[PDB]
Design a protein around this ligand. Structure first.
Ligand SMILES: [Mg+2]
Ligand SMILES: [Mg+2]
Ligand SMILES: [Mg+2]
Ligand SMILES: [Mg+2]
Ligand SMILES: [Mg+2]
Ligand SMILES: [Mg+2]
Ligand SMILES: [Mg+2]
Ligand SMILES: [Mg+2]
Ligand SMILES: [Mg+2]
Ligand SMILES: [Mg+2]
Ligand SMILES: [Mg+2]
Ligand SMILES: [Mg+2]
Ligand SMILES: [Mg+2]
Ligand SMILES: [Mg+2]
Ligand SMILES: [Mg+2]
Ligand SMILES: [Mg+2]
Ligand SMILES: [Mg+2]
Ligand SMILES: [Mg+2]
Ligand SMILES: [Mg+2]
Ligand SMILES: [Mg+2]
Ligand SMILES: [Mg+2]
Ligand SMILES: [Mg+2]
Ligand SMILES: [Mg+2]
Ligand SMILES: [Mg+2]
Ligand SMILES: [Mg+2]
Ligand SMILES: [Mg+2]
Ligand SMILES: [Mg+2]
Ligand SMILES: [Mg+2]
Ligand SMILES: [Mg+2]
Ligand SMILES: [Mg+2]
Ligand SMILES: [Mg+2]
Ligand SMILES: [Mg+2]
Ligand SMILES: [Mg+2]
Ligand SMILES: [Mg+2]
Ligand SMILES: [Mg+2]
Ligand SMILES: [Mg+2]
Ligand SMILES: [Mg+2]
Ligand SMILES: [Mg+2]
Ligand SMILES: [Mg+2]
Ligand SMILES: [Mg+2]
Ligand SMILES: [Mg+2]
Ligand SMILES: [Mg+2]
Ligand SMILES: [Mg+2]
Ligand SMILES: [Mg+2]
Ligand SMILES: [Mg+2]
Ligand SMILES: [Mg+2]
Ligand SMILES: [Mg+2]
Ligand SMILES: [Mg+2]
Ligand SMILES: [Mg+2]
Ligand SMILES: [Mg+2]
Ligand SMILES: [Mg+2]
Ligand SMILES: [Mg+2]
Ligand SMILES: [Mg+2]
Ligand SMILES: [Mg+2]
Ligand SMILES: [Mg+2]
Ligand SMILES: [Mg+2]
Ligand SMILES: [Mg+2]
Ligand SMILES: [Mg+2]
Ligand SMILES: [Mg+2]
Ligand SMILES: [Mg+2]
Ligand SMILES: [Mg+2]
Ligand SMILES: [Mg+2]
Ligand SMILES: [Mg+2]
Ligand SMILES: [Mg+2]
Ligand SMILES: [Mg+2]
Ligand SMILES: [Mg+2]
Ligand SMILES: [Mg+2]
Ligand SMILES: [Mg+2]
Ligand SMILES: [Mg+2]
Ligand SMILES: [Mg+2]
Ligand SMILES: [Mg+2]
Ligand SMILES: [Mg+2]
Ligand SMILES: [Mg+2]
Ligand SMILES: [Mg+2]
Ligand SMILES: [Mg+2]
Ligand SMILES: [Mg+2]
Ligand SMILES: [Mg+2]
Ligand SMILES: [Mg+2]
Ligand SMILES: [Mg+2]
Ligand SMILES: [Mg+2]
Ligand SMILES: [Mg+2]
Ligand SMILES: [Mg+2]
Ligand SMILES: [Mg+2]
Ligand SMILES: [Mg+2]
Ligand SMILES: [Mg+2]
Ligand SMILES: [Mg+2]
Lengths: 135, 70, 386
RNA sequence: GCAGUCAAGCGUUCAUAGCGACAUUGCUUUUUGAUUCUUCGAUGUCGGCUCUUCCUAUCAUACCGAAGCAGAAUUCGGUAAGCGUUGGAUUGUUCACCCACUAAUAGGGAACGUGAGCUGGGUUUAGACCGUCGUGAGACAGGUUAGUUUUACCCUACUGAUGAAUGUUACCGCAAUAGUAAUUGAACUUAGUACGAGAGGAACAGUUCAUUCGGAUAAUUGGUUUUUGCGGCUGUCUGAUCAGGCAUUGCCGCGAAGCUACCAUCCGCUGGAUUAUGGCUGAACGCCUCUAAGUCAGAAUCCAUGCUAGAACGCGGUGAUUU
RNA sequence: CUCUUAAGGUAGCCAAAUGCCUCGUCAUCUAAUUAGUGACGCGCAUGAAUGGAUUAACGAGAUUCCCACUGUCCCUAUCUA
RNA sequence: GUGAACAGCCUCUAGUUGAUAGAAUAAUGUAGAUAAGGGAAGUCGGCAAAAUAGAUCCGUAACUUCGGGAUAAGGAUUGGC
């Protein structure tokens, strides 16, 4: 039911459909290929776009045969589009990365390779627990 | 409010200014503008760029009591 | 036959026509509701849009993720040297609407305002209001005859004020003259106050204060003739398409046999009047204050003028208003600031701000410094200098 | 294709909560047929793109009335078209069908809207292959592949732009009329409450954000570079140096200013009257009844406030008017 | 077994640029595939120089996917003549 | 001259300097360009555009009529002194 505790201030959208981002958890998915964004409305021809902390629906293009060929929810931990927070700073990661997780928002895996943006870790306390450096 | 500093050139960075970049390793790289940033992105060495605080510090450019009563 | 997919219409039909606005002055279409129990003050002010800068402040929005956190915000800066009152105009309501039944002008008129009644000032004999000034030679019973007339009649009294253009960096010399409505009580008290202020000066802080919400009324920065696509936001047409891609493919259906007021078509863009509302007043300037840019947190004596000076504008030597966000129109253009049309609770308004820091870095590029006193400190000493 | 009437039945019981047989009255002209009025000295044919407007037989969002409405959820209905109705996979396709998001992924019209707007993938000439048919030429409503998309300078229409005449010129104003705008979701809390045996599980007040839409604006961040602003490079030319020419802007790093991006920021108002509906008082009719007289409350409605034009044959106040 | 023929489709190939039914079924690739490919074959109407089957290499030939790449697109923006 | 080179680019000789012009620098265009994050979601279809590239070295599959395939694939280098 999109557990997702807190609001989220808007940050620039870097992840349209078709965009394939790296898999930052120990699940054994190598990449997540985003087919939709949770909580995007509609406009003629606009490609639904996710950003840090957004939950998406993905398939796994490279990975364990258990995880391939099936739709499943994700959470974007890592952006690469510069976005702007309310303290003024324009910041961006090196890669696009997310962690496969369940609709509740509970991670598939126990750990996250890499850092995570503070917005996403505040959003999803199960991503909080498994997170390394934050921002 | 903190003034931050450009880790490449060394120039002061006032709030809501410049860019910020989180490399894979979580080393945080703050630029005052596009110029420093774009250098960073070419693998340019600050000590080798004449106007960087790094360079002029390297070249030593322009640096120019009490009583014991116990 | 029908749309085949539904989308909003491009553009807001309410702002039609898209034509070039009537003058660089934007008209004040309304004034705050008169509460006559209050003392008589101006309802609006005249000024010039100088430029923008950045702010830093703590945020009071309990329950927000930034509550008690610092934020940067863009602001804009209006040169606001006191207005001078040159006259009052009275209005009576009729079944046909409100109607002005006289004006009264003070004796001596400034050579800035005088310059406004003239297309060529250097050639004129400068005769304006010379015979009108003769109305003061006696006790001024001709004057008083109107003044008391406006008292007798006139549900509504406005003041004619003008800018002090000379007192600003502009090159324009010919001041801007405008009607301001008087919202203190008792139409008599109003024209009393009017008279006593003839030829006098009135500055901005008699009108607005800090945290107050004010509306901006100005003419849009104009772009001249525009194509369909940027003017209305029409989607670009495909690459492969003959004879133009920035267009509307279907100007309309066969019937009706005429293209419609509602279809996007290429014409003027920009230079419209706009009435823009709800800006919080972040700072109330005094040109007689050194340490304008300063703050209880900052403390280092600097004015709001950036190094290198507001680009295309100048130095802000007088009082000023600083308002959150951006205001319609562009730099050097004459701008009206109006008190709000309504009482807004809204909690976002009513937030009482305290600026921490006002960005003094130069705007002619990516500025590295606030004061000249800092630039020396960091950089040290040069091949000029000592 | 859509809606009624009767009410045998269905619905544990109970015709009509929700339905409904036998029959019967209808509407509609996004079906197809029927016809042949118009056009064969020519009305560019399918679909899609794009864009605008209209319908309502409302999918969503407002307010309501009904339930086989405890709660949740759903379903029937009224006022309702103000407002939104998407992103993809195969397919030329309309259609069909799946995937996914969504408040919802309603149906239709405008010469089956829209080709001097596009495209040309299909259809529908002239090349060619196959299969069936034919002795044959050739045929095939059987499958394929290649196949030139013309013109606007006229009138009107629309978009913006000037303008004679009413003494002149100038400044400040009014506002008939015409336009109008906002949208929708979520989290916190109410509250693990009401309700329920439980499983489950709301709403108003409040707070924080978000969607679509719109008007701006350039502090900041990004884009753009003929500032050919500075620096670098190759080739060749000026004996060399210094400093430069030529390479359709020679190329590359940075690059102000300007323009400009939900890729950046800011902003988007408040009164009134009604609709359905629920009531008061209240006869007709000594009772009863929201209705007949009269009357209270009320929706994304409507009229305004606000917002944009400002009649070039609507107008008011005011300055100065030539030897 | 029977009726019938000049002989009654062999070897091969197949929903093939040959299959009406038809978007055939199964498999595969996909989140999803009237597409592709692999199979199956009472094949409307496959088939032996009316040439059948297969095929290295070739091809501005029709089609399918993948990697790279991209203003094709989200979504537009800016410059030069 | 550079260079593999009658390539492309610059030059000597000779021969031109002909093509209506002036002032601007709206929309739309024709011709040339660049774009943050995404990377074909656009679309009948990657149409179009981008990416690739020269030379030295290293590495080089299925299949094959043993000639090929083959620059397959894929890497490293490169100036001046
Ligand atoms: Mg959607
Ligand atoms: Mg489309
Ligand atoms: Mg920049
Ligand atoms: Mg429709
Ligand atoms: Mg008004
Ligand atoms: Mg074409
Ligand atoms: Mg001070
Ligand atoms: Mg600037
Ligand atoms: Mg018919
Ligand atoms: Mg029909
Ligand atoms: Mg006919
Ligand atoms: Mg005819
Ligand atoms: Mg005909
Ligand atoms: Mg014709
Ligand atoms: Mg015809
Ligand atoms: Mg025609
Ligand atoms: Mg209806
Ligand atoms: Mg129930
Ligand atoms: Mg249910
Ligand atoms: Mg409508
Ligand atoms: Mg029809
Ligand atoms: Mg048609
Ligand atoms: Mg047409
Ligand atoms: Mg055409
Ligand atoms: Mg055709
Ligand atoms: Mg064709
Ligand atoms: Mg012929
Ligand atoms: Mg045929
Ligand atoms: Mg051809
Ligand atoms: Mg073709
Ligand atoms: Mg012309
Ligand atoms: Mg006349
Ligand atoms: Mg119970
Ligand atoms: Mg209980
Ligand atoms: Mg509430
Ligand atoms: Mg917008
Ligand atoms: Mg805009
Ligand atoms: Mg350049
Ligand atoms: Mg050289
Ligand atoms: Mg040279
Ligand atoms: Mg020389
Ligand atoms: Mg030298
Ligand atoms: Mg030369
Ligand atoms: Mg050059
Ligand atoms: Mg810039
Ligand atoms: Mg924003
Ligand atoms: Mg109001
Ligand atoms: Mg009544
Ligand atoms: Mg408004
Ligand atoms: Mg009229
Ligand atoms: Mg008029
Ligand atoms: Mg008349
Ligand atoms: Mg007049
Ligand atoms: Mg097939
Ligand atoms: Mg075959
Ligand atoms: Mg096959
Ligand atoms: Mg099947
Ligand atoms: Mg298939
Ligand atoms: Mg495909
Ligand atoms: Mg077959
Ligand atoms: Mg059959
Ligand atoms: Mg046969
Ligand atoms: Mg045969
Ligand atoms: Mg034979
Ligand atoms: Mg045959
Ligand atoms: Mg053979
Ligand atoms: Mg053969
Ligand atoms: Mg050939
Ligand atoms: Mg060929
Ligand atoms: Mg094929
Ligand atoms: Mg050589
Ligand atoms: Mg040569
Ligand atoms: Mg020429
Ligand atoms: Mg323009
Ligand atoms: Mg360019
Ligand atoms: Mg790009
Ligand atoms: Mg990129
Ligand atoms: Mg990629
Ligand atoms: Mg594609
Ligand atoms: Mg596609
Ligand atoms: Mg598509
Ligand atoms: Mg498609
Ligand atoms: Mg091409
Ligand atoms: Mg070989
Ligand atoms: Mg190679
Ligand atoms: Mg070397």
């Amino acid at each position: 039911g999109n557990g997702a505790q807190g609001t989220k201030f808007r940050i620039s959208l870097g992840l349209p459909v078709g965009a394939i981002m790296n898999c930052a958890d120990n699940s054994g998915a190598r990449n997540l290929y985003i087919i939709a964004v949770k909580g995007s409305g509609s406009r003629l021809n606009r490609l639904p776009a996710a950003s840090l902390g957004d939950m998406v629906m993905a398939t796994v293009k490279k990975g364990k045969p258990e995880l391939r060929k099936k739709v499943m929810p994700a959470i974007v931990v890592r952006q690469a589009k510069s976005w702007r927070r309310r303290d003024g700073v324009f910041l961006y990661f090196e890669d696009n990365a997310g962690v496969i997780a369940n609709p509740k928002g509970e991670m598939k895996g126990s750990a996250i390779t890499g850092p995570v943006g503070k917005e996403c870790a505040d959003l999803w306390p199960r991503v909080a627990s498994n997170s390394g450096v934050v921002v | 409010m903190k003034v931050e500093i450009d880790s490449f050139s060394g120039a002061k960075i006032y709030p809501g200014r410049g860019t910020l970049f989180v490399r894979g390793d979580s080393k945080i790289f703050r630029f005052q503008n596009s110029k420093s940033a774009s250098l960073f992105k070419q693998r340019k060495n600050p000590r080798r760029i004449a106007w960087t605080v790094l360079f002029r510090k390297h070249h030593k450019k322009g640096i120019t009591r009490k009583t014991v009563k116990a | 036959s029908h749309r085949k997919y539904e989308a909003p219409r491009h553009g807001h039909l309410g702002f039609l026509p898209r034509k070039r606005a009537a003058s660089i002055r934007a008209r004040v279409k309304a004034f705050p509701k008169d509460d006559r129990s209050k003392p008589v003050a101006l309802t609006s002010f005249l000024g010039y849009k100088a430029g923008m800068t950045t702010i830093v402040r703590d945020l009071d929005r309990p329950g927000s993720k930034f509550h008690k956190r610092e934020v940067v915000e863009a602001v804009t800066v209006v040169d606001t040297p006191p207005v001078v009152v040159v006259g009052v105009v009275g209005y009576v309501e009729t079944p046909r609407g409100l109607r002005s039944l006289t004006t009264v002008w003070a004796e001596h008129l400034s050579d800035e305002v005088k310059r406004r009644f003239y297309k060529n000032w250097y050639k004129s004999k400068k005769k304006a209001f010379t015979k009108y000034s003769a109305k003061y030679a006696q006790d001024g019973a001709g004057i008083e005859r109107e003044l008391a007339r406006i008292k007798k009649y006139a549900s509504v009294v406005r003041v004619l004020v003008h800018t002090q253009i000379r007192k600003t960096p502009l090159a324009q010399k010919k001041a801007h003259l405008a009607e301001i409505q008087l919202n203190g009580g008792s139409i008599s008290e109003k024209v009393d106050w009017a008279r006593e202020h003839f030829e006098k000066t009135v500055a901005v802080d008699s009108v607005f204060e800090q945290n107050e919400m004010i509306d901006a009324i100005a003419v849009t920065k104009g772009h001249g003739f525009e194509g369909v696509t940027h003017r209305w936001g029409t989607k670009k047409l495909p690459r492969k398409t003959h004879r133009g891609l920035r267009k509307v493919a279907c100007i309309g259906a066969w019937h009706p046999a005429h293209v419609m007021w509602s279809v996007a078509r290429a014409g003027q863009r920009g230079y419209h009047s706009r009435t823009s509302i709800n800006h919080k007043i972040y700072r109330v300037g005094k040109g007689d204050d050194e340490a304008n840019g300063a703050t209880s947190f900052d403390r280092t004596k600097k004015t709001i003028t950036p190094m290198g000076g507001f680009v295309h504008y100048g130095e802000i030597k007088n009082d000023f208003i600083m308002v959150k966000g951006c205001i319609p129109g562009n730099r050097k253009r004459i701008v009206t600031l109006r008190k709000s049309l309504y009482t807004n609770t809204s909690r976002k308004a009513l937030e009482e701000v305290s600026l921490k820091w006002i960005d003094t870095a130069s705007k002619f590029g990516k500025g590295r410094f606030q004061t000249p006193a800092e630039k020396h400190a960091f950089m040290g000493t040069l091949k000029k200098d000592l």
